[PDB]
Write an enzyme that holds these catalytic residues in place. Structure first.
Site, mmCIF file in Angstrom:
data_model
loop_
_atom_site.group_PDB
_atom_site.id
_atom_site.type_symbol
_atom_site.label_atom_id
_atom_site.label_comp_id
_atom_site.label_asym_id
_atom_site.label_seq_id
_atom_site.Cartn_x
_atom_site.Cartn_y
_atom_site.Cartn_z
ATOM 1 C CG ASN A 18 -0.181 -0.118 2.413
ATOM 2 O OD1 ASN A 18 0.926 0.390 2.516
ATOM 3 N ND2 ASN A 18 -0.788 -0.779 3.398
ATOM 4 C CG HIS A 29 4.107 4.929 -7.320
ATOM 5 N ND1 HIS A 29 3.515 4.005 -6.542
ATOM 6 C CD2 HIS A 29 3.159 5.308 -8.268
ATOM 7 C CE1 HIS A 29 2.254 3.803 -6.966
ATOM 8 N NE2 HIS A 29 2.037 4.601 -8.023
#
Lengths: 181, 172
Positions: A18, A29
DNA sequence: CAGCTCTGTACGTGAGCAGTGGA
DNA sequence: CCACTGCTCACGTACAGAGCTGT
């Protein structure tokens, strides 16, 4: 909270448990450190320069690496995700893979895959080993490879030098397949 | 974003810089359990049983302790902040203090105070030590107490308790 | 016993930080 | 003005310690 950076005909797609709080805020990211991810990528040779989360959207299509994440919600994480949370999480994952048909799914973290095999394949796996798992994503020629988390929280792999090895192996598998062609 | 948790008749108002990710995510103030703050609170008699971060809405209740921070915009670090956000940060803060009128404002770092000074009183405060500082909140009888960070001492918590006891005591 | 779901911890590294004491 | 101790954290994951297990 943290979007997907998938295209069609990806070689690799990286799957994360997650998004952390830092990733949720930052919006990109794998920021940190402790996230080896970016360093390892450059170290492994997967990218010829060092980059970082700000470049996450350049990765499919310069490198054919897409990002995605087993569970879209933010937690601390990771110990706080319910057991059912992943189950409904991985299901969606499969569908994504199915649609996108990347050569290889890279599971960043054994905990991910451990539940994944259990629930998607229906196999509790004995004494999992990193690297290639036998199976394919069901309707696709996409291979699962398992890799310890990028998160510095796992202790047994103290440093980016400790996990680089898997990234090297992953690259090998990639240009094995790409090569046969 | 994180709430202020203030009541009118407060003794101590605890003042951080901005909330942090963990605090904002949890929705409560100073959440750890690697934050000393709740331990310090209990150890120094301020609470009498060991509380935890979720219990921060009951602290103006029986304990008279409110929370705030100088900048309510959430962020991981202080480094992430233009001085301008502080400058605006300071005025706003002062307003609420003026409004709520707690006995004591307690600064959660030397850092916060260090810049509270030059924003508010426009000085630098040389070789700052912790404890009670000379000035009061502008146009207020609220004092300033600076105590060290919760993130790293228990002594100062007791001092603050005592100072609170004195303040209570004079009026009675 | 190994074999095995439970929880349930105690793990190394580095960026970051608060406070202090230096080139 | 920057080099110090020590301290949480971080997209976890490896192993003792329970309570069950079979030709």
């Amino acid at each position: 909270t943290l979007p997907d950076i998938l295209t069609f005909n990806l070689d690799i797609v990286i799957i994360g448990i997650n998004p952390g709080l830092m990733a949720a805020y930052k919006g990109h990211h794998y920021p940190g450190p402790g996230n080896h991810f970016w360093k390892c990528l450059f170290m492994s040779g997967l990218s010829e320069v060092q980059l970082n989360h700000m470049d996450d959207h350049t990765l499919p299509g310069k490198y054919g690496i897409g990002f995605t994440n087993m569970v879209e919600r933010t937690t601390p994480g990771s110990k706080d995700l319910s057991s059912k949370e992943f189950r409904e999480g991985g299901r969606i994952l499969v569908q994504k893979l199915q649609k996108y048909q990347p050569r290889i799914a890279v599971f960043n973290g054994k905990c991910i895959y451990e539940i994944f095999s259990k629930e998607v394949f229906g196999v509790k796996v004995k004494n999992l080993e990193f690297g290639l798992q036998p199976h394919k994503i069901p309707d696709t020629e996409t291979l699962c490879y398992v890799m310890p988390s990028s998160s510095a929280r796992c202790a047994q792999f103290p440093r980016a030098q400790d996990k680089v090895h898997y990234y090297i192996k992953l690259k090998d598998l990639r240009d094995q397949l790409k090569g046969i062609e």
